[PDB]
Design a protein around this ligand. Structure first.
Ligand SMILES: *[C@@H]1O[C@H](CO)[C@@H](O[C@@H]2O[C@H](CO)[C@@H](O[C@@H]3O[C@H](CO[C@H]4O[C@H](CO[C@H]5O[C@H](CO)[C@@H](O)[C@H](O)[C@@H]5O[C@H]5O[C@H](CO)[C@@H](O)[C@H](O)[C@@H]5O)[C@@H](O)[C@H](O[C@H]5O[C@H](CO)[C@@H](O)[C@H](O)[C@@H]5O)[C@@H]4O)[C@@H](O)[C@H](O[C@H]4O[C@H](CO)[C@@H](O)[C@H](O)[C@@H]4O[C@H]4O[C@H](CO)[C@@H](O)[C@H](O)[C@@H]4O[C@H]4O[C@H](CO)[C@@H](O)[C@H](O)[C@@H]4O)[C@@H]3O)[C@H](O)[C@H]2NC(C)=O)[C@H](O)[C@H]1NC(C)=O
Ligand SMILES: *[C@@H]1O[C@H](CO)[C@@H](O[C@@H]2O[C@H](CO)[C@@H](O[C@@H]3O[C@H](CO[C@H]4O[C@H](CO[C@H]5O[C@H](CO)[C@@H](O)[C@H](O)[C@@H]5O[C@H]5O[C@H](CO)[C@@H](O)[C@H](O)[C@@H]5O)[C@@H](O)[C@H](O[C@H]5O[C@H](CO)[C@@H](O)[C@H](O)[C@@H]5O)[C@@H]4O)[C@@H](O)[C@H](O[C@H]4O[C@H](CO)[C@@H](O)[C@H](O)[C@@H]4O[C@H]4O[C@H](CO)[C@@H](O)[C@H](O)[C@@H]4O[C@H]4O[C@H](CO)[C@@H](O)[C@H](O)[C@@H]4O)[C@@H]3O)[C@H](O)[C@H]2NC(C)=O)[C@H](O)[C@H]1NC(C)=O
Ligand SMILES: *[C@@H]1O[C@H](CO)[C@@H](O[C@@H]2O[C@H](CO)[C@@H](O[C@@H]3O[C@H](CO[C@H]4O[C@H](CO[C@H]5O[C@H](CO)[C@@H](O)[C@H](O)[C@@H]5O)[C@@H](O)[C@H](O[C@H]5O[C@H](CO)[C@@H](O)[C@H](O)[C@@H]5O)[C@@H]4O)[C@@H](O)[C@H](O[C@H]4O[C@H](CO)[C@@H](O)[C@H](O)[C@@H]4O[C@H]4O[C@H](CO)[C@@H](O)[C@H](O)[C@@H]4O[C@H]4O[C@H](CO)[C@@H](O)[C@H](O)[C@@H]4O)[C@@H]3O)[C@H](O)[C@H]2NC(C)=O)[C@H](O)[C@H]1NC(C)=O
Ligand SMILES: *[C@@H]1O[C@H](CO)[C@@H](O[C@@H]2O[C@H](CO)[C@@H](O[C@@H]3O[C@H](CO[C@H]4O[C@H](CO)[C@@H](O)[C@H](O)[C@@H]4O)[C@@H](O)[C@H](O[C@H]4O[C@H](CO)[C@@H](O)[C@H](O)[C@@H]4O[C@H]4O[C@H](CO)[C@@H](O)[C@H](O)[C@@H]4O)[C@@H]3O)[C@H](O)[C@H]2NC(C)=O)[C@H](O)[C@H]1NC(C)=O
Ligand SMILES: OC[C@H]1O[C@@H](O[C@H]2[C@@H](OC[C@H]3O[C@@H](O[C@H]4[C@H](O)[C@@H](O)[C@H](O)O[C@@H]4CO)[C@H](O)[C@@H](O)[C@@H]3O[C@@H]3O[C@H](CO)[C@@H](O)[C@H](O)[C@H]3O)OC[C@@H](O)[C@@H]2O)[C@H](O)[C@@H](O)[C@H]1O
Ligand SMILES: OC[C@H]1O[C@@H](O[C@H]2[C@H](O)[C@@H](O)[C@H](O[C@H]3[C@H](O)[C@@H](O)[C@H](O)O[C@@H]3CO)O[C@@H]2CO[C@H]2OC[C@@H](O)[C@H](O)[C@H]2O)[C@H](O)[C@@H](O)[C@@H]1O
Ligand SMILES: *[C@@H]1O[C@H](CO)[C@@H](O)[C@H](O)[C@H]1NC(C)=O
Ligand SMILES: *[C@@H]1O[C@H](CO)[C@@H](O)[C@H](O)[C@H]1NC(C)=O
Ligand SMILES: *[C@@H]1O[C@H](CO)[C@@H](O)[C@H](O)[C@H]1NC(C)=O
Ligand SMILES: *[C@@H]1O[C@H](CO)[C@@H](O)[C@H](O)[C@H]1NC(C)=O
Ligand SMILES: *[C@@H]1O[C@H](CO)[C@@H](O)[C@H](O)[C@H]1NC(C)=O
Ligand SMILES: O[C@@H]1[C@@H](O)[C@@H](O)OC[C@H]1O
Lengths: 718, 240
């Protein structure tokens, strides 16, 4: 009974610009516009045609049913979304776009239209900065002061409502701007553009820009208000449905900076085995190679890596993961081949170096070059995959520079602070300004192609192995790849802000999200920061490690400091935080494995419908609890630091030191005559719609659950 | 009894730039080069593929027989024209182009090569003026002081030998600059580019430029000296 469309698309000739609006998927429209020159056809797109799931039988392409010059208004309907072409000002024409949703009660609601009041700039603004035909684009849409914006990628802003914020589309450490957002008006929006630019979520206008492009492309999809699960169902059908993760990846992931040689890794597996502590994956960090670009473990410290991986699996059964950077230096054994075959990006004048690290200036390999993706997998499969290390940590691949928002990485902080301009490098698919947002997405794709090639499996099916990435873009959830929040400081305030970042990633479509348990960097202004021997940081780490139990992936990592050292770096093992804390840390490791059925079940629903794994409170209780609508707009701590982990668990980490009581807001569920929330540690039941102060000792993380505990532990929750 | 070629083309990977040299028509080679991004396929071309008249049965397109990174020299012959890829300086490589004609007496004559003496700018120079990927191109070829250049379109200069002249490729009343010329060394040259630019017929270097483009494209055809009627036969078979 779906309201199928009666037109394959409308093509408007508005002066020299052509606008092609097509119905796209369920309750969606796709809009493309270009001035003068038609699309090359080789533009980079992040949406599926046809959508993974929709009313269509075949791809749309450039097909349309009606052609007009926009002299008269027209109307097109697909599902519950309606397009109405109108004039500007008091005129009656059809060159301006407006989008409505047909509500259940028959009435219509304006989702958004092109921002064109009487006195305003053109809502489709084109500008030619160069001698060629490539142009910059500025597209403006109307907005209301009360609107709320969710998603837009990841960022350490401590907010889930992005209204009133400007988000630059330039990648760096912990900052993955992605123009995919949901609005509380009941619609989602995808700016299907690989160019760097700008996101303006202003009071009265939403504006997206593209630094250099040959074609503007966006998709708008409508859903009934409060029904965010459908919006995510439509977004995932447009940009990608996640695969199912391998079962081992749902366990405890041990990592640190860094395990330096082979014997240290073998003694680590011996420790887990002798102490009978379960571990699912052991991670080897960076600087384990001879040269930047060798893409192999330094044999002087990893003499027999096939024996190391086999010994690790014999003692603990854990798989292994190794780190690789996209940088290539001249001392690399692959430097000559990478240079000769054009597999390196380069700044567009000068020697071509893109950044620096390890005392050498380097060039990033070209992940947009398909030949370069093949070259890099030939190295990883030879030196890692065929030697027992079949999971890969693709770090510092933000694109342009080497992972940071400053140039001259690895040098002094004074030199790094000098405002050297970020490089507009040359890629095989364009420049950094025109296609730069593709770089980390294509880097994930390089290993996805390698994984699927070795296992003879199609993308989207069950994964055998995973990759750990720090960046991505539209539809990155389609890969056997998990995103982590990047380099964070080991202080209390950081733990509170990480929650809102993972909730924003969920609204962008990313489910495989995680953090570094305990932070990564030491805060120099906090004397105890990162010191595993001080009681101050031991408290912070146990609070942080407990939270990672209720995250899509539980992984510990960081660069710790200490008073006593017995390795290359300070330790980060479950027994390295004091004798009193070891039983606390190991208990959450066991609890993580006890939640395996629940984890594999909620990861499966994310694979089928895009059902968000960690869930901001508006997705489940906006229809019910009337107070949640305002708690999200104001970015209250009850909505930026609490979330539903799966359909049954409500989690709220303790983000302050010296605390035995924690105030948790239990949302309303719609039945006032019951007490649906059961505290995990006391089994006490509470009624919804109030703030309760529950006992939160250092060993207990505030967690409530709906229904019975024994059912959620069974997995049958959908 | 035409000396048909034994290769459909050679594709050189010289760093980030790709050079595709193909035999094209009778006694002709077609050269295309681009940095980083492959040709869109919608570039504007003024030559026929296949030529109106030639040894071919079907169009060449992007087809080639041999792929190399230009580490070693190679040789390809089509008709009476021969291509020899060489190095720069005293090096032995295959990323620089040189064109010879096989004379009737068996000897060979150098028509032109890429202008690359020891100290000189790159004969295939690329420059990015805008934020996008479109580039300006400057391609340089060697020339001798005694050479004579005929053609280059129309102009009120009272000269038929255009040697020593710079011809801007911008149209106005009575001035139709067209980069199609014959040399008295026995070869013709077509700069198959719709972009505005510059023609430099200097004493020791011939240089063509393109203000903005995504692909460089030229064709060189050889003929026995004094035989200009054949050169015009080849040019018309290429362009109409
Ligand atoms: C205190 O401070 C407050 C601010 O803090 C302040 O609030 C502001 O108040 C003003 C006025 O109260 C508000 O302004 C209005 O905004 C309305 C909404 O605008 C948006 O949406 C419309 C589309 O709306 C359609 O669909 C929705 C939902 O379905 C309906 O609810 C609407 O009625 C409307 O429906 C019609 O058209 C549909 C499609 O064709 C049909 O399906 C349907 O059947 C209906 O026919 C968009 O068009 C707007 O876009 C415009 O502006 C954006 C952003 O600036 C631009 O990007 C874009 O390009 C456009 O320019 C916008 O997004 C407006 O609808 C409303 O418009 C009326 O009045 C203005 C004059 O101010 C006229 O110019 C305009 O033409 C409208 O007039 C018609 O209706 C009025 C009365 O309703 C009639 O009097 C008039 O004759 C005219 O009649 C027309 O339609 C009649 C319908 O039958 C028809 O009978 C007639 O024959 C005729 O055709 C106006 O602009 C503003 O939003 C408030 N701001 C905020 C933040 O709240 C407050 O006032 C202050 N208080 C005091 C005391 O000072
Ligand atoms: C008065 O003022 C006058 C100026 O107004 C001044 O005249 C100038 O004089 C100098 C010297 O007399 C001239 O310079 C020479 O120019 C020659 C021509 O250069 C062009 O063409 C060559 C290609 O030439 C090949 O093919 C043609 C035709 O078929 C043959 O005739 C050639 O012999 C040559 O053939 C060989 O290679 C072919 C292909 O592989 C084979 O098929 C064939 O079998 C042969 O093996 C191009 O390469 C040149 O391009 C270069 O320069 C251009 C433009 O600058 C660049 O764009 C390009 O990138 C290149 O850099 C050019 O277009 C040159 O051949 C000649 O080169 C020789 O000497 C120089 C040193 O000066 C060496 O560096 C160079 O390697 C050459 O050396 C070899 O041969 C010499 C003697 O012949 C040997 O002594 C030497 O050992 C070496 O041997 C090599 O080959 C031998 C062949 O068998 C082999 O046995 C050896 O083992 C070894 O491999 C030189 O540069 C200049 O042109 C005059 N200028 C003018 C306007 O006239 C005059 O001198 C003044 N008088 C006085 C008294 O002061
Ligand atoms: C940019 O990045 C690059 C990399 O991306 C950076 O390069 C790296 O820097 C790191 C550290 O900054 C280096 O780690 C050090 O490496 C050295 C060298 O190890 C090698 O060479 C040893 C000797 O080689 C010589 O003899 C051999 C004989 O065959 C000969 O072939 C060769 O030509 C040469 O003449 C080898 O013995 C050693 O192998 C051993 O261990 C291997 C591990 O499993 C094993 O496979 C082998 O079988 C063999 O057993 C290896 O090949 C290491 O020595 C060094 O380790 C020391 O220091 C670290 C702390 O940094 C410490 O944790 C270690 O315990 C170790 O410390 C001993 O000596 C210390 C004195 O300094 C002493 O204080 C310690 O106590 C300890 O010694 C004693 O007691 C303890 C316990 O009581 C006991 O365990 C000891 O046995 C001993 O009795 C580091 O691993 C990387 O190697 C290096 N990588 C590269 C490619 O260079 C670069 O710095 C960056 N550059 C910039 C500008 O930023
Ligand atoms: C591959 O990887 C393996 C595994 O990491 C690595 O092996 C180990 O290297 C580390 C670091 O070099 C070794 O740690 C050192 O051991 C020495 C000596 O230890 C012995 O004696 C003690 C006595 O109780 C025994 O318990 C122990 O088993 C050993 O027999 C220690 O002296 C080192 O500690 C000091 O310096 C640290 C700072 O670097 C301080 O934090 C720490 O407090 C220690 O210092 C102070 O100690 C005293 C103060 O009271 C005093 O002496 C001074 O003030 C001093 O500063 C450190 O623990 C570790 O033993 C190695 N493990 C094994 C199995 O060999 C390989 O070396 C590596 N191979 C490579 C890289 O090639
Ligand atoms: O950046 C080079 C510059 O660092 C100066 O350090 C300043 C810097 O520290 C960041 C750095 O921390 C490491 O951890 C250190 C910690 O900083 C120390 O406080 C603690 O005592 O020791 C630990 C470990 O020994 C992390 O391991 C590094 O990752 C981290 O550096 C960043 O590294 C990433 C890649 O790993 C790179 O992408 C970033 O560009 C880089 O910044 O910043 C904080 C300041 O307080 C420090 O002073 C240092 O003094 C100087 O000598 C020079 O080496
Ligand atoms: O509390 C305000 C004040 O704290 C300063 O820090 C103190 C800590 O309060 C104290 O617990 C700590 O104790 C260490 C002890 O030094 C060490 O011997 C023992 O083994 O471990 C104890 C707990 O980890 O000392 C620090 C002082 O730190 C350093 O800086 C000051 C200098 O005088 C010391 O020598 C250093 O150790 C903070 O430094 C200060 O900023 C705060 O305002
Ligand atoms: C399709 O339906 C729309 C109403 O949404 C109408 O305006 C349009 O004329 C119809 N077109 C055809 C071919 O029926
Ligand atoms: C692993 O191999 C060791 C011998 O090195 C053996 O003792 C042990 O039983 C094996 N364990 C497993 C799980 O295969
Ligand atoms: C994967 O790629 C390899 C070459 O790298 C190719 O030989 C093979 O056919 C492809 N497919 C599979 C299932 O291996
Ligand atoms: C809460 O109930 C669970 C079983 O559902 C039980 O394992 C646990 O011990 C109880 N906690 C108490 C009684 O504090
Ligand atoms: C074709 O002939 C050339 C000589 O001009 C020779 O160098 C080349 O190796 C030949 N290639 C083949 C396939 O015969
Ligand atoms: O996880 C870290 C990553 O973010 C970067 O800093 O490289 C070093 C790693 O330890």
């Amino acid at each position: 009974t779906y309201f199928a469309p009666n037109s394959t698309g409308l093509r408007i000739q508005h002066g020299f610009e052509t606008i092609l609006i097509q119905p796209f998927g369920y309750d969606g429209f796709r809009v493309r516009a270009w001035p003068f020159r038609p699309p090359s056809g080789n533009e980079i797109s992040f949406i599926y045609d046809p959508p993974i799931e929709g009313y269509e039988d075949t791809a749309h392409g450039m097909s349309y049913d009606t052609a007009t010059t926009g002299t008269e208004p027209r109307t097109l309907r697909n599902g519950n979304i309606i397009l109405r072409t109108t004039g500007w000002g008091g005129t009656t024409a059809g060159y301006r776009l407006s989008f409505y949703r047909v509500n259940d009660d028959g009435s219509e609601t304006l989702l958004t239209n092109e921002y064109a009041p009487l006195k305003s700039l053109n809502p489709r603004y084109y500008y030619w900065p160069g001698p060629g035909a490539e142009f910059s684009a500025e597209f403006s849409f109307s907005a209301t002061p009360d609107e709320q914006i969710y998603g837009t990628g990841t960022q350490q802003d401590h907010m889930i409502n992005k209204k009133g914020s400007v988000i630059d589309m330039v990648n760096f450490n912990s900052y993955i701007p992605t123009p995919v957002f949901m609005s509380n008006k009941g619609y989602a929006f995808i700016w299907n553009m690989p160019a760097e630019g700008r996101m303006e979520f202003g009071t009265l206008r939403t504006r997206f820009t593209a630094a250099s492009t040959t074609l503007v492309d966006y998709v708008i999809v409508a859903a009934q208000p409060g029904d965010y699960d459908t919006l995510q169902q439509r977004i995932s059908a447009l940009t990608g449905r996640a695969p199912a993760p391998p079962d081992f990846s749902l366990g405890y992931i041990q990592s640190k900076l860094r395990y330096e040689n082979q014997t240290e890794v073998e003694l680590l597996a011996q420790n887990f085995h002798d102490r009978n502590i379960p571990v699912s994956m052991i991670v080897i960090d960076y600087q384990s190679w001879a040269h930047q670009g060798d893409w192999a473990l330094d044999p002087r410290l990893w003499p027999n890596v096939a024996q190391m991986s086999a010994r690790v699996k014999n003692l603990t059964g854990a798989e292994m993961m190794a780190s690789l950077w996209p940088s290539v230096a001249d001392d690399s054994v692959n430097y000559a081949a990478l240079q000769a075959n054009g597999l390196l990006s380069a700044t567009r004048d000068g020697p071509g170096t893109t950044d620096s690290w390890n005392g050498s200036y380097i060039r990033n390999y070209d992940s947009t070059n398909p030949s370069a993706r093949k070259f890099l997998w030939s190295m990883l499969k030879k030196n890692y995959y065929d030697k027992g290390i079949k999971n890969f940590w693709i770090d510092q691949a933000d694109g342009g520079a080497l992972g940071e928002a400053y140039e001259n990485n690895g040098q002094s902080t004074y030199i790094e602070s000098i405002p050297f301009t970020l490089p507009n490098v040359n890629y095989a698919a364009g420049t950094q300004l025109s296609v730069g947002k593709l770089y980390p997405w294509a880097h994930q794709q390089a290993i996805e192609e390698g994984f699927r090639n070795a296992t003879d499996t199609k993308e989207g099916s069950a994964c055998d192995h995973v990759s750990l990435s720090r960046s991505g873009y539209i539809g990155s959830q389609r890969f056997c790849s998990m995103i982590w929040s990047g380099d964070t400081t080991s202080v209390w305030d950081t733990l509170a802000v990480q929650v809102a970042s993972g909730l924003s990633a969920a609204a962008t479509g990313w489910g495989w999200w995680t953090v570094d348990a305990g932070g990564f960097e030491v805060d120099s202004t906090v004397w105890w920061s990162g010191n595993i021997d001080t009681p101050e940081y031991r408290e912070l780490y146990v609070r942080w490690l407990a939270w990672t139990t209720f995250l899509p992936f539980m992984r510990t990592h960081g660069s710790r400091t200490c008073y006593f050292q017995d390795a290359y770096t300070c330790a980060n093992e479950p027994w390295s935080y004091g004798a009193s804390n070891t039983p606390i840390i190991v208990s959450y490791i066991h609890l993580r494995y006890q939640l395996g059925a629940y984890l594999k079940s909620i990861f499966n629903q994310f694979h089928l419908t895009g059902r968000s794994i960690m869930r901001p409170l508006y997705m489940d209780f906006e229809k019910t609890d009337p107070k949640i609508s305002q708690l999200v707009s104001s970015n209250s701590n009850y909505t930026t630091q609490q979330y539903m982990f799966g359909p049954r668990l409500l989690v709220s980490p303790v983000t302050l030191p010296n605390v035995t009581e924690w105030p948790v807001y239990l949302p309303q569920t719609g039945q006032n005559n019951t007490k649906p929330w059961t505290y995990w540690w006391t089994n006490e039941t509470y009624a919804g719609g109030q703030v309760v102060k529950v006992p939160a000792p250092l060993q207990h993380i505030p967690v409530f659950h709906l229904g019975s505990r024994e059912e959620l532990l069974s997995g049958n929750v959908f």
